[PDB]
Amino acid sequence: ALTQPPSASGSLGQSVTISCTGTSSDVGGYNYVSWYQQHAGKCPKVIIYEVNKRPSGVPDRFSGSKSGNTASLTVSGLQAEDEADYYCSSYEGSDNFVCGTGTKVTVL
């Protein structure tokens, strides 16, 4: 149900914004979009929750927003370490969630 571009790129030191599009019953419906960073072989780590909040220990160069049915994650000061798969999720009511299929961010 959530659409993410399969790939995105950015340059070392620069920014990248990636998108996650749903419907009025998930992303448009609630302010409960989360973003997950998954390095290779690791568990997906929450880097953003409630659209734009960062958990403890997540730097402020990660930010989130949403407008209409579209959520966005921006990463600034791109480091080689930021090359990972990024997933979005949203509540959809009924104690249930929808997920995107992830964006692989390549850092060049």
Added chain:
Amino acid sequence: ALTQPPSASGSLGQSVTISCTGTSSDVGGYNYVSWYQQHAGKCPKVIIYEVNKRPSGVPDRFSGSKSGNTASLTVSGLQAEDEADYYCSSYEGSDNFVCGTGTKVTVL
């Protein structure tokens, strides 16, 4: 840190057991192994937690166990619908988790 076979197979109506091997500080360390079923484009769904407990609405043909550093998920009465990627996770102390890279179960 958790090793799962990338692929496993079973026959319609029959069983499949898949494994998830860690160390004495995760899988051997605690009784907090979970298993997740991920159908294509869906969020990973908890089908087993605390090694062998099923959440509400998960059938009893899904079962879990663990011995030493090895956890196992068995699925009986295999249905075509059971073709999915299955992931394991374990606590590893410090409020932290480790994950496997998943097993794609092919139902023939």
